[PDB]
Symmetry: D2
Subunit: 396 residues, 4 copies
């Protein structure tokens, strides 16, 4: 049949993939090659003119990576996909394909740190200006739009407190003003949120997180209309960033995404249990999790997301020193950056990543001294809870 007709779990397993045509191999072969051989001058010419299907060179395209791209296009309900060397490369390949000197972007302020760095420091040096706004307030997005605005850029849920952005509303605002909406869907995966179905034009992911899910791949993906993806591929990737994905990385990501449905279900079931535990703990001042009814945008979450996600942020009593004590007291949770791994990961930005940053600078970014971010893994939730309880009690 057509893989676009099956249930979502069936698609996760099968979409974009098929047994190898020459051998019947069930696993997608790893086409770890740089180049491809033609049977004749004519076949070569036909492919370079695009009068013929087939491969030429891995930077341009590759059968293993094509399977991943097609799978993710199916899962996001987009026309086409483009795999990249990293999440950052997915974002920059996208924006550098769309924008040129004199153009403007309206971006959420509550975004991934490195994305913020690209937008605030690099883009302007190429003559592309960026206005940062609070995207939880769609009116701020409207107010910042200019005649030269080409793109509105958002993430939801957002760092660090998992605030939300109303995708459908923002899409309508962007489109009314003739701009595209690009959504970073990394935190949710297509299993939990589908920005294209809500009106977004382009979705990007760091597959480094949930899509791969196994903490062993750096990579990104872009999904959108064929006409845009063709430009992102044959100009953005080919000429500008050169950020192609290794066939081995694509194969690992294909392998990891096979279990996306069951992983997300467990991540989110575990996260809800842990979030409820934290919300009841007298040493914890705040818990940020879309699945708690106390979330300021709970109702939007119920409309836009199928599950509340696997990430929790929370604030511990006693600020900086308590956060440090707590994170140094966990025995099961692992101190690391990143998220979406099978192992539970924990970080305390004020004493770790953002130690080098001024306290007032941290606050403006929504990072309080006691803020802890937890990526909930696939362990027994009782074990994670017991580890957190132990560490919190010691710290406070």
């Amino acid at each position: 049949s057509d893989c676009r007709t099956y249930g979502f779990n069936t698609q996760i397993v099968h979409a974009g993939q098929q047994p190898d045509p020459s051998t019947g191999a069930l696993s997608t072969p790893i086409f770890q090659t740089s180049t491809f051989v033609f049977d004749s001058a004519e076949q070569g010419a036909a492919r370079f003119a695009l009068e013929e299907s087939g491969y030429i060179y891995t930077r341009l395209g590759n059968p293993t990576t094509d399977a991943l791209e097609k799978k993710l296009a199916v899962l996001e309900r987009g026309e086409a996909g483009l795999a990249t060397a990293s999440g950052i490369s997915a974002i920059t390949t996208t924006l550098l394909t769309l924008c040129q000197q004199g153009d403007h972007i309206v971006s959420a302020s509550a975004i991934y740190g490195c994305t913020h760095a690209f937008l605030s420091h690099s883009m302007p040096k190429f003559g592309i200006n960026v206005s940062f706004v609070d995207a939880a307030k769609p009116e701020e997005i409207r107010a910042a739009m200019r005649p030269e605005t080409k793109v509105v850029y958002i993430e939801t849920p957002a760092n660090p407190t998992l605030s939300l952005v109303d995708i459908e509303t923002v899409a309508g605002i962007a489109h009314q003003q003739g701009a595209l909406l690009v959504v970073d869907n990394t935190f949710m995966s297509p299993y939990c949120q589908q920005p294209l179905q809500l009106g977004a034009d382009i979705v990007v992911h760091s597959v480094t997180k949930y899509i791969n899910g196994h903490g062993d791949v750096i990579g990104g993906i872009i999904v959108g209309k064929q006409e845009f993806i063709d430009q992102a591929r044959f100009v953005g990737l080919k000429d500008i960033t050169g950020g192609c994905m290794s066939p081995f990385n694509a194969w690992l990501t294909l392998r990891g995404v096979k279990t996306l449905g069951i992983r997300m279900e467990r991540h989110c079931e575990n996260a809800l249990k842990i979030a409820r535990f934290l919300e009841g703990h007298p040493s914890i001042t705040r818990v940020y999790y879309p699945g708690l009814s106390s979330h300021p945008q709970y109702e939007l979450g119920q409309r836009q997301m199928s599950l509340p996600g696997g990430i929790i942020s929370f604030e511990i009593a006693g600020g900086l020193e308590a956060g440090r004590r707590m994170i140094n007291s966990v025995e099961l949770c692992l101190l690391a950056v990143s998220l979406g791994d099978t192992e539970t990961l924990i970080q305390h930005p004020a004493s770790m990543t953002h130690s080098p940053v001024a306290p007032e600078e941290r606050l403006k970014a929504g990072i309080t001294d006691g803020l802890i971010r937890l990526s909930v893994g696939l362990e027994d939730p009782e074990d994670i809870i017991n580890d957190l309880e132990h560490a919190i009690r010691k710290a406070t």
Copy 2:
């Protein structure tokens, strides 16, 4: 001892590598990971502040990739290396790190096609203008320099006829005017040419070609001063292109480069034999190979290159149709783009890659209708010669 003190073959094998510290494993382990775990909040903070050695996240750095970077820095006699997702990414990460809106670049015209596309179409759209010149004439480089020129960019030998550029002379001209010289050393590898030793500031490679050598990796490398590489890493790669190399790709490239010395010796020995055969063949109008005494810049080649390389271009009698007939008549040489593989590769641009291009447009790029490019592999040269003789005779 210090690996920088050994002979070049010893360095090829050993530089940048060591047995694994925890296990003694001889092969560099494949650190196919996204993230790294800290033992404490304090250790995490120290690494983010750069007060401590150690890893954080593979996009920023990785032990496997670090070995490759250090090895290539040693081989090029540069301070530091930076691995990338592709040769293109090495070039663009370099130039986008160095240049901003209002800046200017002077570039050779005889350069890699996709590089030409980036420089001619993409850079100007970011407000960075490029002047193209004939770099075989250092005076044209001087004449094109402007107060805003930041970079002079060259490749040598150059496509498609393997003309040369005088690195030392061009370096002096660039430096007198306060610009950096960037050299694409892909065709030669560090075994055959060392641009940094001749005054270049930065060297880039597609490792897809000779450095890896096994036709199974797309990748690039940048070598230069520590201060520049630090910016290329923590700004160019981290924020702008996102073009990081997969640890698996770095491991394959480490593995491939182990045999760089013996491969280049054989590629070049084979190429010289084939070039001499072609030069004596009455159906071949021209042969472009630095190792032939008839090369217009032969003497420069002898001063700048340790070996004449593994690439040959030649023109067959009878133009377009003869080139097509010939390439369709080889039985051993493989019709493919790319170069530097263990297999002999052949292409006829006018009937293949550049078929879609106007004949006069091809000519301006130095591509005549009968021009064939041959990447000489590791086969017995008698077999390659016999295959060429057979195909040439049939075609003419």
Copy 3:
């Protein structure tokens, strides 16, 4: 803490693994090496004498494979593990380590085909005799025991109709007579059955099936007492079969087993739904599945197994031709041998694998003309059911 103290899901994720000591890498590094380097003659001597921890050579042991071995030992509640090149190698390394000329084995008859071949044809040619019995009847096992019997060998559930063997009862019988009990636990995985906890001495798996779960690894594992595993390693593997596992295969298996808990839960939930559908279908004469109350050994299953498994066998009305028609009519289920993959796999032995076999020979092995074996994957069960319904209806 100690990984043996955590919940089973926590163990699945964490047991046998730790961040890399030298780098903190979260993913177990792929130690794809043949040999290991010593810091001194003395260190080498200490390791060969076994007076020192550390590695020597990958056939003897490897850090990546050691992690897998330790994880599986934890999951089966055994002392030690030994990884192998295949499930077959796990079985033969085990039995060839234990048995010599003149020894005897009592084996179940309802076992994996290739195991049956080894036991019936190869063992006797080495002077090791085997008696085959119906292991669903523990009294047949007792009756076949001889003074020279060293081993009783069983699989449960068994091929092809998923009959069971009472592990605890058989263990007691074997031990009373001074024999070891070896159990092939492939069909269940440690998540669903724990033979060592029921008195078995040694457990073997083809990790090719559920433990890896991703249809991309051939491999085996042996778990048992340290003293036995040491002999299986330093004699059986080192000298006799040479069946060591590649570090890359061990790494993939580690990666696959991370999701064992969530995969088995979904496989079994899906299988129960499909089995109930089949049991209600008028074109299906019989359904063999431990989770159906009509299973002849249902109660034993409830005592010995935590879940009913992901495999179903069933008989279609109309025998050979109907089975052929049905299997040629599925659109989602894939025609293939093997089991435990994320994709649903289906086979019809009488028209496929056992076509070359005489009908009466097939019957003696429990293979009827209409018997179909289904390995239930991770797709939406509604999609699998609809595919089966469609194919069954067309066929009957």
Copy 4:
């Protein structure tokens, strides 16, 4: 054409390989799969009956591994190849396929240690007796033959002093008496010696050594007549040892063997230079190297071998303590077991591997207290010589 018609270097690069049929990928794809899918019941049946070409299951066969098997068959001038999990598995799969209880083997005494262990301790326990002889004396081989002798087994050059065995003469003796000759060709590779061309029936290798050459694969290969290889595959491997090779390992070995010709040339050129240096050194009592005219079987070597190999053994003045001092004093050579890597490896058996062994037991095996074994790598020979000179001088 036919790959069996090209020169040996051409065969090394091309034999057994072809661009991928579905995509044209130049690198042999990594078919990292367990199973294969059939298009119909009929296609499945045809393959199991062997009425049809195609794959079924990786333990039985795999497209990546098939390429390696075919390549090595071409290089050894044998009909067919069979890849295995290790060199040991190549040997035992071979001998356990050929021999049964009551059979007899005549083996060289100067053989690989683990092979000796299998033959002396394991085989007899399966009722297969082995007579060990000095194979440098073909008359000892004849004298040990019995009516039940099925196989004569030899290695050449032999451990530890690189003595030789006259393959052609021994083949004639074996055949006159109705036995097969099996030759372990690991030390030479097919580039330096071709036992099948001299009358051997079966060749085995540890590909862990020179064939792979990169110190990152454990693996073996068997080459012989189709009828024998079919039995070794469908009985020996399938049922008995289960020692199949991982497709990834086969792919790495294919990749490594591409440079076999150029590697062996350099290994042997380097080894001859080092051997001559050692022969002139007053602190070195003996040097064992086939390339020295003082070798007791020099003339046989010139007739049987195309190059003298990359391995050297030598004895240092001062026995055990001097050997220990010397090996602890090298700075470039790496202390490790194994051989055939790109790095120079060194070991001193009396103070390392064989420390746990009684001095008189070592002597009987040809291991003197001052004996050092050197696997010469691809480094500059001047650097290796300088390292050896430094270490020898310090030690003596």
